[PDB]
Structures are given as structure tokens and as C-alpha cells.
Amino acid sequence: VNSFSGYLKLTDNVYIKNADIVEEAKKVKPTVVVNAANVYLKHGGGVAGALNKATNNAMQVESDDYIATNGPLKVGGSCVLSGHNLAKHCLHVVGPNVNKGEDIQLLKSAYENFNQHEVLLAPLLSAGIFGADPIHSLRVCVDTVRTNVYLAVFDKNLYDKLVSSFL
Numbered sequence: 704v705n706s707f708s709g710y711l712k713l714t715d716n717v718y719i720k721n722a723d724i725v726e727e728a729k730k731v732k733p734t735v736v737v738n739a740a741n742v743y744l745k746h747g748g749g750v751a752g753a754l755n756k757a758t759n760n761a762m763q764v765e766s767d768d769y770i771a772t773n774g775p776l777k778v779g780g781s782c783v784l785s786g787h788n789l790a791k792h793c794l795h796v797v798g799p800n801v802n803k804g805e806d807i808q809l810l811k812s813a814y815e816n817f818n819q820h821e822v823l824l825a826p827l828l829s830a831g832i833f834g835a836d837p838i839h840s841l842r843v844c845v846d847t848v849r850t851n852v853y854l855a856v857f858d859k860n861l862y863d864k865l866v867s868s869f870l
């Protein structure tokens with residue numbers, strides 16, 4: 704038993720809710736919140752901008768130190784950093800950005816990072832400003848992640864379409 708509430712169960716291990724991941728994180732304090740990161744951990748907009756703003760920019764400060772030490776992530780890769788006031792940990796995961804021409808097949812590799820964590824609160828990778836089809840992203844999620852994932856979908860209209868079209 705865990706503290707996530709109001710989720711629709713899609714599969715044995717994947718759940719989905721129309722929610723703001725920031726507000727969801729501040730209420731649940733999950734062990735892991737996933738950020739839709741880029742390779743530079745520059746949290747300017749989308750989910751990343753929103754999560755970082757909710758940390759009063761502490762996420763960005765920590766991220767800049769991480770990059771200064773380690774260099775950029777790989778597309779499809781991840782790193783674990785602090786969750787600040789939102790979660791114990793933040794798993795920063797880089798899905799391919801279609802608006803940068805990155806290969807969509809890397810989306811499966813991105814979701815594989817979730818399997819290193821038993822339970823996660825997450826957005827749909829490569830959705831929103833990353834330019835992928837959220838229905839495809841949901842399919843890859845279900846077909847790749849084996850651990851327990853709670854997907855927060857900000858847009859109610861999109862949440863309805865994702866549910867209604869789910870196979």
C-alpha cells in the first residue's frame with residue numbers, strides 16, 4: 704500500500720491521473736519524482752521549469768554543480784539528484800526531443816531508467832514541449848517499465864484522450 708490517490712489503473716504496474724506533477728509531488732512526497740530533463744539539466748520550461756520553480760531554483764543550482772563535475776547526460780540517460788521539497792530523490796531522465804531531431808527509438812532507453820526504482824511519480828517522457836506523441840509515449844512506458852509508475856498528466860483533455868485510446 705502507498706499514498707497515491709485517484710489514479711486509474713492501466714496495467715499491473717502503470718497508473719495515470721490528471722494532475723499537476725508539482726502539486727502531486729508536494730502532497731505525496733514520493734521517494735522518486737521524475738523530471739523531464741535535457742542533457743544540460745537546464746530546467747527552463749515544461750515539467751522541468753515547473754519542478755525547478757517549485758524548488759525556488761535549488762534544483763538548478765544542484766544541477767549546475769552536477770554538470771560542472773560530470774558533463775552532460777546522454778539522450779536516453781538519467782541521473783539521481785535531490786528531490787528538494789518535492790520528493791526524496793529526483794530522477795532526471797532525458798527523453799529524445801523531436802523538436803531537436805533526436806531519435807524517437809531512444810524513448811525506450813529513457814523509460815528503462817525507471818526500472819531502477821521500485822515506485823515513481825512521473826510525467827510522460829518526451830511529451831509536451833519535447834514534441835513526441837503522448838499516446839506513443841504511454842505505449843512505450845507500459846511496454847518498458849516494470850516497476851510501479853504513477854503518471855501525472857497536466858492537461859485534462861490529453862488525459863481523457865490517453866485513457867480513451869489506451870489498448
Ligand SMILES: CN(CC(=O)O)C(=O)c1ccc2[nH][nH]c(=O)[n+]2c1
Binds near residue numbers: 724830
Ligand atoms: C506532457 N506534459 C504536459 C501534460 O502533462 O499534459 C508535462 O510534462 C508537464 C507537466 C506539468 C507541467 N507544469 N508546467 C508544465 O509545463 N508542465 C508540463
